[PDB]
Symmetry: C3
Subunit: 380 residues, 3 copies
């Protein structure tokens, strides 16, 4: 088997009207239901993706300076000026400089000076926001299939399934990210989920999200430094590419994989199915009594939870996986289990168990004592 | 007819307990249900409104300068000063200026100078945020009516309906805006929905949202420019009203209509009705076989979806509107249809069909081939 | 009694499958249900807490200045410099100052000067954000108990209850705060809920949320002022502790009580219970006919609603509390009542009634005319 059956309590057959069913669809899993004398149905969330996220802000990480120009005046000659001061492509600075007989002036004193240099971004990176319009879930329904799209705005879909006819499916996000707080930082072919404020405070030149020209950078001086003015000239220098510094700053950040302009997430949905009055098949699994083997150690998800991948090597599958979370002592914690009714449908086949441990030290207990796994975990 | 009946699968009559019903209420539509030997009931969302949204920030778009004053010193006389430098109503600037025998000093050199001018906002605009407390939906229930209010915080209401007695109605928002990302920009009698960051980065003088005085503007220099200082005087000039520039900057922005301090939105609700155990009337509509006429071409909604207004000119109404969305090729897309179970209750009467097309090029297909409408659409 | 029974319409027993039940759990209340020949069950939300909220930003409210150092040059000697200019712990300022025979220079004129002073924060405060991972609700289920944890990410829990066996409980937040808009401001042992932008615009030196060192403050000049330079020295002064000013600025702000690193909120949940097919006990209460006494006058909650605490002194309890909200005239308002089906389970025992009045002037009407309470209220 590959598919997990719903519990008898997961559906209600009305005296009149239809039959309502609740199902939880997590990546890697398969949920099945069957009506009397009707084709068996499988439900599976295939992917969660954000398509074409809009740009919140663009940051320049490598800029080059060219066309340096300076206007210097002698005492009594007033303020210098440059047309470039009005060209947003240029970074400029006004200051005072010593003038005298050595540099063509008849008086010794401070003279005004202004220098401008053309700022050209060579490499940038941008923060993008995921809005409701960008999120899409893909669910496949297989009678024995049909691929349906689900979005935050369009959560309801009617699908005709042979044997059942029309069946309504209404799904909503269950364990994702707060896209108002978390922003997607993109540098070339890579991406990371980062906090919005951290992103907005980065000390780099920037342009608004809807900017198309990409030339009138704000806060160019974050990368530019004007050297001390000489009598009639002044040099302007720039930091080198900040690509490396960004990588360092991103050390702990969650990395997201991209598919050319679109990102893949580990989605989780809660769905309600509405169909004609029909007596459905409920399933009850016995607790596994065998030992489990850890396939992949406790790992954090992209969305503040953890997953432990295990494999059942005992007997009696399909069976329910004994699971518990307890505090520093031995007090069990009810709740915190994302993968409710965790069942292994077969032996020697990896299964993901998702959970949300309490802050501090806790223990993840899997299986019954004969070979029971006791995993430590520290959070935040 | 005007009202659309629920599907048999849209309700469940318990063996014991009550009867639960699901209904979707969109603007322009009417949903009806009827119990056995009981009065027929109509449900309709009448309006979605945001009342008294609080101010996030206030921007000055037209300022006037008065009371220009300057203190200028000769070399060796140190720094000039003005009491107004401490008055937040004034914009001030310190600089150096050439002094000499021509302007009353005994020595030629740079002297410090300071100039302040009173900044007075003449016209402002403000960004307002819609919080949960500001949103209100109005639903009318008509037996054959009763007006009920629904808010994000108070989504449940018990209403006594003759024939049914008490019936519980629980509704929640279904296809709206992300008020954490979108902000309402107001200029006089007009309003627009804009992105929060774009708004927060506007290069204009501003005051915090809770500000009541409206005089101590931050960043006055966004509108003010100090001319080059003369020996003992200096002029200060200001940009003109930025009303026009804002209109240009708002070119593509979604415009929102206001009703003196309150804004109207196109709301959409999902509601659950709970009532005494009762056998309800379910309705099944046949597919329309006639031709449709486009009343209003595909138009974008305020909330990232689209609406196509059509009219049925064929026979057999009430009937279901054949509808489909397909990609650049001909692959149909399941889901994406906001107006599920789109039915025309009568001939020659406009009906709104809402949908959320995929990014890129897609086709909206309405009606069956004999005169089928094939509408192109490009998104993002 | 202490517990409130569900209404017959609050549950549905399927012909096949299970029995689904809806319950609303508010602080201070107790909801009970009972199946035929089964133990009676009580449900109660015990607390809503945010644990270990991450820091958004840190502000310094009291800083001390030490190690003031200045480099001053004579005319013709160019720009002064200090190594400390590169030390982020120091606040520095460049300017011009008059030099002459009185201070060791051979020429009279403006000379460059630079002064730096070590900035050390002595007292800070920080804004923290509540993310989904930080919120936890504690619900106790008592047969006649079991404590279950509920979080935004883990809203579903299966609990074994003697007599019923396994029962699924799925709960979600119902009347809380928008943690994307509201931020927690913490000063020592106290805390307040404040608007994010107001917080982000405070005119104080700051450090990013993930900052651990707490020494390289941004915008130190918000607290520091450089006095007018003297020939070879210059004093730097700082504002005193801004603790008092903050308290003044926080005058109207909602205060939150803390429990050493974690905050307590008034939570409200909506829960769905799924269990084996079982005929449950529904309860119908008669309207109270007696007089009520006000225990605590209308008070605002932490989340934009109001609560009126009353006591029933009449006869017939348990009975339903007559309740209504009406506008400036006498037009009743349906909806707006958070505590739906407000019942007093006993005489002389305080009961909280929560509601969300319309903006403007409204009246809260409690009880039937013989001694009816008519409470005024103004909102926003
Ligand atoms: C530098 O001179 C101007 C300054 O903007 C610029 O247009 C040009 O491309 C640069 N090179 C030349 C022509 O010197
Ligand atoms: C300008 O002078 C002061 C400067 O603030 C101001 O109070 C006054 O109204 C203005 N007009 C006068 C009296 O000159
Ligand atoms: C001031 O001098 C340096 C400046 O940073 C500092 O390290 C030291 O602790 C202070 N006190 C002394 C040694 O003068
Ligand atoms: Cl000089």
């Amino acid at each position: 088997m590959r598919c997990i059956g719903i519990s008898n309590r997961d559906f209600v057959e009305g005296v009149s009207g239809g039959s309502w069913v609740d199902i939880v669809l997590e990546h890697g899993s398969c949920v099945t239901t069957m009506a009397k004398n009707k084709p068996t149905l499988d439900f599976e969330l295939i992917k969660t993706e954000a398509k074409q996220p809009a740009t919140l802000r663009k940051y320049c990480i490598e800029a080059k300076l060219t066309n340096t120009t300076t206007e210097s005046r002698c005492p009594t000659q007033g303020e210098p000026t440059l047309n470039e001061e009005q060209d947003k492509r240029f970074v400029c600075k006004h200051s005072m400089v010593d003038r005298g007989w050595g540099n063509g002036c008849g008086l010794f004193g401070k003279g005004g000076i202004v220098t401008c240099a053309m700022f050209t971004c060579k490499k940038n990176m941008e923060g993008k926001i995921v809005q409701p319009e960008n999120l899409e879930y893909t669910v496949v329904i297989t009678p024995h299939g049909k691929e349906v799209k689900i979005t935050p705005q369009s959560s309801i879909t009617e699908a005709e399934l042979t044997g059942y006819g029309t069946v309504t499916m209404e799904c909503s996000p269950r364990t994702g990210l707060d896209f108002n707080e978390m922003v997607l930082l993109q540098m070339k072919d890579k991406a990371w989920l980062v906090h919005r404020q951290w992103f907005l405070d980065l000390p780099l030149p920037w342009l608004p999200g809807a900017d198309t020209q990409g030339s009138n950078w704000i806060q160019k001086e974050t990368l530019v430094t004007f050297k001390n003015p000489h009598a009639k000239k002044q040099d302007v220098v720039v930091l080198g590419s900040q690509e490396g510094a960004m990588h360092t700053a991103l050390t702990g950040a969650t990395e997201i994989q991209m598919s050319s302009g679109n990102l893949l997430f580990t989605g989780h949905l809660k769905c309600r199915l509405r169909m004609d009055k029909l007596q459905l098949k409920g399933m009850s699994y016995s607790m596994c009594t065998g030992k489990f083997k850890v396939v992949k150690e406790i790992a954090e998800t992209q969305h503040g939870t953890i997953v432990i991948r295990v494999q059942y090597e005992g007997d009696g599958s399909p069976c329910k996986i004994p699971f518990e979370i307890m505090d520093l002592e031995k007090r069990h914690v009810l709740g915190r289990l994302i993968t409710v009714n965790p069942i292994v449908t077969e032996k020697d086949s990896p299964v993901n168990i998702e959970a949300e441990p309490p802050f501090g030290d806790s223990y993840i207990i899997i299986g019954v004592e004969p070979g029971q796994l006791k995993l430590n975990w520290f959070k935040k």
